[PDB]
Amino acid sequence: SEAEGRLREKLFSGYDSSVRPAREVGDRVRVSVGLILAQLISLNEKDEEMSTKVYLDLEWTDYRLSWDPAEHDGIDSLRITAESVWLPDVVLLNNNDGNFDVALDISVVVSSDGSVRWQPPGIYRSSCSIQVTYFPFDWQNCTMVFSSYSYDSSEVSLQTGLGPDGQGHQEIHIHEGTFIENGQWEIIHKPSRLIQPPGQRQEVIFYLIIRRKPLFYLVNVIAPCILITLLAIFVFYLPPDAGEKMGLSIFALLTLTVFLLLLADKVPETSLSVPIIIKYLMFTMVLVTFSVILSVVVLNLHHRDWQFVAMVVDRLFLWTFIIFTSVGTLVIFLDATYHLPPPDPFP
C-alpha cells in the first residue's frame, strides 16, 4: 500500500504522542465519551462490586492528524495503532481493584479532517453501594465514573456522546441482538450525565439502574421459610399426648438454621442496614422459639381439669400465633413489594 505507507509516514513526522493537541496555549481538547455495554458480567454484594464488559467510544480532534485526501490518493480514513497517537487518559475513577485502564489498545480511526475515534474494550470492576434493605427484591443504582486522570478541565473538556440521529442520546448503548443478557439482573434505566466541578476535573457518569429478578430466592428461601412457619403454626394443633411437640418444633428450628446457613453464603456482609429477608429469618426464628416456649407451657399445664385448661390454652396460643404470624408476614411482604425502581433515574 504505497499511498497509505507514504501518508502514514508523513503524519507521524515530528509527532509526539505525549503532548496533547492544543493548538493555542489556552485551547481545550473536547472529548466525547460514549459507552456500549457488551455484558453485565456480575454484581457482587459482598464486595459491593459490579463487573462489566464494555466498549468505550471516545472521540476528539487532533489537528496534527488532518490531511487532504485528494492529494493522498483519495484515502479518506486511516487505521492506526493507538499507542502511536495521543490518547486522553480517560480512566474509570471509581474502579474497585486498581485497574484503571482499558483491556486492549486496539487501533484508532482517524478521519482526514483530524477526527480521531477510539473504541477500546474494557473489563471493569467498579465499586457500587448496595441497597441491602430490600434484598432480594432490591434494585441497584450503580455508577461508572470516567475522567482524565491527569488533565484539568482547563485542558481536556469531557462531554457525553451523541446518538446515531445526532440527538443528545445521553445513555448507555445496548444493541438488542448483541447484548449478553444477565440471568439475575434486568437493566431499566441507563442514562449518562456530565458532572461539572464545584485544578479541577469534569466527570462523565454512566448509570446502570438494574432490578433483581427474585424468582430464585422466592423458590429456594422464601417458600421454605413459609413452609417452616406453617409447621411452627401447626405445632400448636398437635395434642400434648402425641409426645412429638418438642421434636417437631426443634427440628423445625434446625431446618430453619440450615436455611440460615444457606442464606449466609449469599447476603451482603456490610452492616449499614438489615436485609428484609434477614429480618424475615430472624422473625421466623423468634416465632419458632416462642412456639417452643408456649408448647412447654402447655405441656407444663397438661401434666399437672388441668388437661382441659391446657387444651384451651393451646387453642388460644394457636390463634394468637396465627394472628401475629399473619400480621408480621403481611407487613414484610407488603414492604418488600411496594419498594420498586423509580420511574426517573434522578428523582
Binding site: D16, R20, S150, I250, V292
Partner: protein, 336 residues
C-alpha cells in the same frame, strides 16, 4: 502543542534519572508526601492485613526541569510520563504481601519552576497487629510506615504535607468507621552514624467496627439457643421429651457452630468475645443435659425432683442472663 513539543524535547535531551535532582550534591532533596485514603478495602484479622486504596501525592523540585514560559508561548505547566524522571523510592515498610513500591506510573505534572507533583494510585496491604479480644466491638489502630528505601535523611528529606491524612475523597466503608487518623514523621539515629538521620512517615488510622451485622447473624442465634437451653427444666418429666429437647437443641447449636466458624475469625492469638460466648453456651447446654439426666435419675423423690426442677429453671435462666450481660453490656458501656 508545537511549543510544548519543543519544550519536552529540550528538557529531556540530556536528562539523567539516575542521580538526584539537586544542583549541589551536598544539598538535600526535600519531598513533601501526602496520603489520600480513597477506600478502606478490607480488614483481615486472620492474616492481620489491611487493604486500602490510596493516592500517594509526592511533591519535589527538580533543579534541571526549569524553563522560561516566554520561550514557549506561555506554557506554564506540562504533563510528562513519570518513568522518564528521577523519583523518590518510597516503600511501604510494613507491606504484608502486596507491592512494596508504586507500580502504576501515572503522569507527572511539571511546572515551569521545576516543581513536580506526582499522584500515583496504589493498593496497600499493610501489616498491623489485630486485637480480637472484644470482637465484634473492637477498634484497630493500624498504620502505614512509608519511607525512602535506599536514601537516608541526609540526601532525601521527606516531610508530611499535613498532620492528618486526606479523607476528602474517602468512600464510606460498610463495616469500619475511621475514628481518627494522623501522620507523624520520625527520625531514627543509629550507633554507626551520629550525623545521618533515617526518616520515615508513619500514617495511622484508628478505625472502629460496625458490629450490627455480627449482632444479627451470630449473637442473636446463640442467644436464642442459650435461652432455649434452660427451658427443658420447665418441661414435665411425664412428657418424656426432656432428653429429646435438650439433645436436639445441642444438635442445632452444633450445626450453627459451622456458621459461626464460617463467619468469625479463626485467630489463635486470643479468643474473640463471641467465641467466649459460643463456648459458654455450648458448656451451658452440656451442663443442662447432665443436670437433666440427674433429674431423670432422681425422679425414677418425685416432689424432690420437681422442686429441683423449679430451682434449676431459675438458676439456669439467671446464669443465661448474667452471662449475656457480663459478655456484652460491659463493652456496650465502654462504647457508650
Amino acid at each position: 502543542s508545537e511549543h510544548e513539543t519543543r519544550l519536552v524535547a529540550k528538557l529531556f535531551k540530556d536528562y539523567s534519572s539516575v542521580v538526584r535532582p539537586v544542583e549541589d550534591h551536598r544539598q538535600v532533596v526535600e519531598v513533601t508526601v501526602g496520603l489520600q485514603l480513597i477506600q478502606l478495602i478490607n480488614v483481615d484479622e486472620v492474616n492481620q492485613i489491611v487493604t486500602t486504596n490510596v493516592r500517594l501525592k509526592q511533591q519535589w523540585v527538580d533543579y534541571n526541569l526549569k524553563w522560561n514560559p516566554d520561550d514557549y508561548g506561555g506554557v506554564k505547566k506540562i504533563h510528562i510520563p513519570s518513568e522518564k524522571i528521577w523519583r523518590p523510592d518510597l516503600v511501604l515498610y510494613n507491606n504484608a504481601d502486596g507491592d512494596f513500591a508504586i507500580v502504576k506510573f501515572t503522569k507527572v505534572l511539571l511546572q515551569y519552576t521545576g516543581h513536580i507533583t506526582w499522584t500515583p494510585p496504589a493498593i496497600f496491604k499493610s501489616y498491623c497487629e489485630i486485637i480480637v479480644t472484644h470482637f465484634p466491638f473492637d477498634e484497630q489502630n493500624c498504620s502505614m510506615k512509608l519511607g525512602t528505601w535506599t536514601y537516608d535523611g541526609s540526601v532525601v528529606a521527606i516531610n508530611p504535607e499535613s498532620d492528618q491524612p486526606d479523607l476528602s475523597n474517602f468512600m464510606e466503608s460498610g463495616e469500619w468507621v475511621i475514628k481518627e487518623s494522623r501522620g507523624w514523621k520520625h527520625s531514627v539515629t543509629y550507633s554507626c552514624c551520629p550525623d545521618t538521620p533515617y526518616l520515615d512517615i508513619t500514617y495511622h488510622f484508628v478505625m472502629q467496627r460496625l458490629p450490627l451485622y455480627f449482632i444479627v447473624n451470630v449473637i442473636i442465634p446463640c442467644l436464642l439457643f442459650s435461652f432455649l437451653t434452660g427451658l427443658v427444666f420447665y418441661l414435665p418429666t411425664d412428657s418424656g421429651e426432656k432428653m429429646t429437647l435438650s439433645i436436639s437443641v445441642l444438635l442445632s447449636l452444633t450445626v450453627f457452630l459451622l456458621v459461626i466458624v464460617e463467619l468469625i475469625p479463626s485467630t489463635s492469638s486470643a479468643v474473640p468475645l463471641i467465641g467466649k460466648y459460643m463456648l459458654f453456651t455450648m458448656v451451658f447446654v452440656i451442663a443442662s443435659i447432665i443436670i437433666t439426666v440427674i433429674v431423670i435419675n432422681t425422679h425414677h423423690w418425685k416432689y424432690v425432683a420437681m422442686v429441683m426442677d423449679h430451682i434449676l429453671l431459675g438458676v439456669f435462666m439467671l446464669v443465661c442472663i448474667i452471662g449475656t450481660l457480663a459478655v456484652f453490656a460491659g463493652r456496650l458501656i465502654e462504647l457508650n
